[PDB]
Amino acid sequence: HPETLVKVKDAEDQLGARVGYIELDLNSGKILESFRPEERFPMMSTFKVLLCGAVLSRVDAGQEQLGRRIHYSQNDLVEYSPVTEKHLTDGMTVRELCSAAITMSDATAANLLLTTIGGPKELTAFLHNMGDHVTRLDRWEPELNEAIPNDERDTTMPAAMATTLRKLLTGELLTLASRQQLIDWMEADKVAGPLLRSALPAGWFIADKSGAGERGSRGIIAALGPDGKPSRIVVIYTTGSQATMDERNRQIAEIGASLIKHW
Ligand SMILES: *C(=O)[C@H]([C@@H](C)O)[C@H]1CC(SCCNC=N)=C(C(=O)O)N1
Ligand SMILES: [K+]
Ligand SMILES: [K+]
Ligand SMILES: [K+]
Ligand SMILES: [K+]
Ligand SMILES: [K+]
């Protein structure tokens, strides 16, 4: 609904920065509403969903096991590793790492998982192979969050990310067991509460992944819908703002409040 575009452009104004937005019908793939849908924005942590999608594709192909245990050390820990920092002694399994990477947005977990698939080049090759010729991961945590103006490294476009999430959550790309596992990790959450979830009505479903990087970058990707089932995909990214995290979170929550109201 155009009233949501009023809020999205108001958010750009309030934040003094670019906001990218897209609302997609999950079943049909139809773009219902958009703003700067084909401009690039840093993915930040939202890439972790794509990463675990690739991991699950490997699991399906018999090239990985969710129960495989990965051992790491203090040497491996990067900034923001709330879960991995507690398991240095006995390690964590692949399943546990994706749960950490998605529900807590653990950065070290993402790096360990990236290593299992062959690094950024392989995640990018996975995306290209699934029809996403835009989204690219080029670096590891923490550098991938640099958000350098006009830099195409580690970026996606709202339309591309929305289309990719749709394929991951509904396409024959993954087995049903794997699709649901990805959805289960996205439904769980300990960090995106101030975002779309703060505007979600009781009874509604939401599977999401947020992100925050340098230079004011902030974003979220999500599949949500009434009556416990997802029916639309929403992608929101912003970069360039000097606003506080609370201010950026509120704008994303208000964009969510609008799209829900006009559903
Ligand atoms: C992803 O965008 C980053 C990166 C460090 O992996 C992480 C860190 C953060 S902000 C720290 C805690 N978040 C919220 N309480 C996020 C994030 O999305 O908020 N992901
Ligand atoms: K429209
Ligand atoms: K555009
Ligand atoms: K160790
Ligand atoms: K989540
Ligand atoms: K949210």
Single-letter residue type at 127:
L
Ligand 5 center–CA 199 separation, angstroms: 15
Q: Is 28 one of the annotated binding-site residues? A: no
Query: How many residues are given for the chain?
Result: 263
Beta carbons of 32 and 166 less than 8 angstroms apart: no
End-to-end CA distance of the chain: 8
Q: Is 57 one of the annotated binding-site residues? A: no
Please, what sign has the CA dihedral across residues 218, 223, 225, 229?
A: negative
User: Which residues lie at CB < 5 A from ion ligand 6?
Assistant: 192, 195-197, 208
Class of domain 1-263: alpha beta
Resolution, given in Å to one decimal, reads 1.7
> Which residue ranges have their beta carbon within 6 Å of ligand 1?
44-45, 80, 105, 107, 141, 145, 191, 210-213
Beta carbons of 126 and 54 less than 8 angstroms apart: yes
Ligand at minimal distance from the CA of 160 is 3
Burial class (CB in 10 A: 0-12, 13-18, 19+), 139: middle
Catalytic residue among 3, 38, 85, 143: 143
Please, what sign has the CA dihedral across residues 7, 9, 195, 197?
A: positive
Ligand 6 center–CA 200 separation, angstroms: 8
Mind giving me the DSSP string for the chain?
Answer: -HHHHHHHHHHHHHHTSEEEEEEEETTT--EEEEESTTS-EE-GGGHHHHHHHHHHHHHHTTS--TT-EE---GGG--S--TTGGG-TTT-EEHHHHHHIIIII--HHHHHHHHHHHTSHHHHHHHHHHTT-SS------TTGGG---TT--TTEE-HHHHHHHHHHHHHSTTS-HHHHHHHHHHHH--SS-TTTGGGGPPTT-EEEEEEEE-STT-EEEEEEEESTTS--EEEEEEEES--S-HHHHHHHHHHHHHHHHHT-
Q: Catalytic residue at 143?
A: yes
Ligand 1 center–CA 4 separation, angstroms: 26
**Tokens coding 22:** 């897209």
Single-letter residue type at 204:
W
Cα–Cα distance measured from residue 244 to residue 173, given in angstroms and rounded to the nearest whole number: 38
Ligand at minimal distance from the CA of 79 is 1
Cα–Cα distance measured from residue 59 to residue 55, given in angstroms and rounded to the nearest whole number: 6
Mutate-to-test residue for ligand 1 from 46, 49, 105, highest number of ligand atoms within 8 A of CB? 105
Give, using CA atoms, the residue closest to atom 15 of ligand 1: 191
Single-letter residue type at 119:
G
> What is the position in ligand 1's atom list of the atom closest to the CA of 44?
2
Burial class (CB in 10 A: 0-12, 13-18, 19+), 190: exposed
Single-letter residue type at 141:
E
CA distance readout (Å), 163 to 55, 92, 189, 206, 223? 19, 31, 22, 17, 11
Ligand 2 center–CA 96 separation, angstroms: 40
Q: Is 211 one of the annotated binding-site residues? A: yes
Ligand 4 center–CA 91 separation, angstroms: 6
Please, what sign has the CA dihedral across residues 149, 151, 18, 251?
A: negative
> What is the position in ligand 1's atom list of the atom closest to the CA of 107?
6
The ranges assigned to domains in the chain are: 1-263
207 has which bridge partners? 223
